[PDB]
Structure formats: structure tokens, C-alpha cells
Amino acid sequence: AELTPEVLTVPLNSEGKTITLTEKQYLEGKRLFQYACASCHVGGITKTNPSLDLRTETLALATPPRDNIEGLVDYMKNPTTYDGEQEIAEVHPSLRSADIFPKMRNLTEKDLVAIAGHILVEPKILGDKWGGGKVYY
């Protein structure tokens, strides 16, 4: 098996448009994800609220839908609760809150896309493991 364009191909937006990542972008996003995110989201779980994970089907049911680059890039700017009802930039790392979350400060716009790309690609590779927790280690 290998990292083919069909696996590196993920939804851009909810319209249904797609984008094909490069291997570079994928590994760029994996690295950036370990830097800024894995402390809480290693393996696609959420250590500080295990009821919410980064599986694609969970993101799909978030309000607004987050199973696409646009939603995820947006979330990294202005995070909300799962129902979209309140903004949680004060307690979730975001560009909006990079002053209290200093690791988000040197993230560029294309870094955000690499990270969102990684999050959407990894479930296609790892399957149930991604967001499944220790049961699947």
C-alpha cells in the first residue's frame, strides 16, 4: 500500500469540491499537528474531553460541518462548541487566541491547511484506530 492521490484527496468544502494534498503537505500537517495539537489529540482522541474526537463522522455532525478543509481551517481560527452555539477561543488554541496559546502564533494560513489535511487523511489510512483510543492501540 502507499500514499496515493486518492487517499490524499479530501473535501475542500461542504459544496462537495475536493482538493488533492501533496505528500509534502500531508507530512507537513502531521508534524504541525504533533507540535500544536497532539498533546490533547494524539491518535485523534481528545484527552481533556474524550466525548469529542477527530473522526470524520464526528466532524461531519458538528455544527457547522467540520469534515472539510474549510470547516477545519475555520475552527482553527474561531473554534466553537459542537452545536456551534458558543465560541470557545478562550479555552481552545486558535489564531483568535494565539495571545494566550502562543504556539498558534507562527502558524501561517498554509500551515492550517496542512493540519486540516492531516486530520482528514489519517482516518483513511488508520481506520478505526484514528479516534478509537486504547482499544485499538
Partner: peptide
């Protein structure tokens, strides 16, 4: 909580059953 002083000798963070990711 997510920076508890637990980790492997090769600097994988977390409990001994945790997967690689966090250095």
C-alpha cells in the same frame, strides 16, 4: 494535565501504553 511528568526513556510522552506522537 496533558504535561504530567510521565514518559519513556526515548521521550515518548504519557503513560507507558501511549502511542508515539508526543516528544
Amino acid at each position: 494535565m496533558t504535561h504530567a511528568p510521565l514518559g519513556s526513556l526515548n521521550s515518548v510522552g504519557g503513560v507507558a501504553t501511549e502511542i508515539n506522537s508526543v516528544n
